[PDB]
A paper describes a structure:
SNAr1.3 can operate at a rate of 0.15 s−1, perform more than 4,000 turnovers and can accept a broad range of electrophilic and nucleophilic coupling partners, including those that allow construction of challenging 1,1-diaryl quaternary stereocentres. Biochemical, structural and computational studies provide insights into the catalytic mechanism of SNAr1.3, including the emergence of a halide binding pocket shaped by key catalytic residues Arg124 and Asp125. In summary, we have established a biocatalytic solution to SNAr chemistry, one of the most important classes of transformations in the chemical industry.
Notably, iodide was found to be a more potent inhibitor of SNAr1.3, with an IC50 value of 1.20 ± 0.05 mM. The resulting structure reveals two internal iodide binding sites, with the most occupied site (about 85%) shaped by Met64, Arg65, Arg124, Asp125 and Pro128. Notably, Arg and Asp residues are a common feature of halide binding sites in natural proteins, despite the latter being negatively charged. Guided by the structural analysis, we performed site-directed mutagenesis of residues lining the halide binding site. R124A and D125N/A mutations led to substantial 180-fold and 68-fold/22-fold reductions in rate, respectively, with more modest 5.4-fold and 10-fold rate reductions observed with M64A and R65A. These assays further underscore the importance of the halide binding motif to efficient catalysis, although the large contribution made by Arg124 could also be ascribed to its role in nucleophile activation (vide infra). Notably, although high levels of selectivity were preserved with the M64A, R65A and D125A halide cavity mutations, the R124A mutation led to a substantial loss of enantioselectivity, suggesting that Arg124 may also play a role in positioning and/or activating the nucleophile 1 for selective catalysis. This hypothesis is supported by molecular dynamics simulations that reveal productive conformations with the enolate of 1 forming hydrogen bonding interactions with Arg124.
Residue numbers in the entry: 1 to 182, 188 to 231
Amino acid sequence: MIRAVFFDSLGTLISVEGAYKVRLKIMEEVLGDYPLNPKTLLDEYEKLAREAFSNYAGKPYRPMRDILEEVMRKLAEKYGFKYPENLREISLRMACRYGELYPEVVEVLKSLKGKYHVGDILQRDTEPATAFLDALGIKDLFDSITTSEEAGFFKPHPRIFELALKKAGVKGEKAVYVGDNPGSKNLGMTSILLDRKGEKREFWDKADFIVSDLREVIKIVDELNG
């Protein structure tokens, strides 16, 4: 049976409007009056971050705030503005201020929490990640929160999943993982791909289920439990 349902909250439960506005506000704060378009800085930042994280995929963990600060240092040198001090504070303030959940998130977590172990699996440093979840009002809706910093490795390393399962006290066969990107297979978890806009059809085959609204998750799991 299914006894645990895991999510990737800061990555699949944050509205894209909200995620973009947070990142734009960060860029705007960094630049101040410097004569560079913040949307151009943002696009270039997302480029270098994606690249830097892929270099680390599956590797031993290194603080993500440190990696992002190197990226911003490259951008400051590239465009000529002064490297912002305390960038991690700027980012955490802007996320707590403007971060936003998809509309059905709270209802879905509250409904699962009575009958299942509800967990979060996150690739974000633990301290800022947990402060963000508190600001969003969902930290205490989770039975467990597990990060790559706790596990010691970046995805797709299985270790983060092994630890999340240990916290829930079950083997992979008893759990589902809801993510928006397709490591996790050898452990036996049931994968649900969240594809709100039907934009990742080429990756549907590598997922056991595909949804566009999180309210479909309770149905899949209630179904799987006879």
